[PDB]
Amino acid sequence: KVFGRCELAAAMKRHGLDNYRGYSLGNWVCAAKFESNFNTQATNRNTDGSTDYGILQINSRWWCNDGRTPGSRNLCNIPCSALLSSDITASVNCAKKIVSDGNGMNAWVAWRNRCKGTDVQAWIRGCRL
Numbered sequence: 739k740v741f742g743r744c745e746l747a748a749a750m751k752r753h754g755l756d757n758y759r760g761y762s763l764g765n766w767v768c769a770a771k772f773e774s775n776f777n778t779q780a781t782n783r784n785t786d787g788s789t790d791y792g793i794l795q796i797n798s799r800w801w802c803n804d805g806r807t808p809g810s811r812n813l814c815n816i817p818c819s820a821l822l823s824s825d826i827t828a829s830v831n832c833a834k835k836i837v838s839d840g841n842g843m844n845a846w847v848a849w850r851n852r853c854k855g856t857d858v859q860a861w862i863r864g865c866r867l
Contacts, residue, residue: 739824741776743767744865751867753830759837764858770794772848779822792821792829801832
């Protein structure tokens with residue numbers, strides 16, 4: 739599913755990411771834009787041979803099992819294909835684990851390079867939330 743901006747803001751809020759570990763909702767929506775362009779089906783292979791899945795591009799090296807990433811963990815205990823559904827519940831609970839991880843949203847290279855330091859409120863401006 740390709741989400742609209744506010745539609746995802748609203749799903750992200752209902753699943754409890756708004757200020758989760760102190761990250762306002764616009765951080766999460768910005769991260770999603772520059773990771774998947776809001777597309778639950780987005781997949782991208784990494785140079786290390788892992789793959790990133792879903793609206794938040796969660797990788798198979800650490801967080802999920804895709805049956806082809808050697809020597810990988812699945813710390814969120816799920817198939818990576820769960821991360822591609824239109825129900826974003828798996829991506830969101832997994833994202834909670836990742837972000838509690840020690841490095842915050844720096845774990846998302848797009849957030850760090852494109853969202854951090856920026857006016858992330860603009861990503862939800864105009865949404866009914």
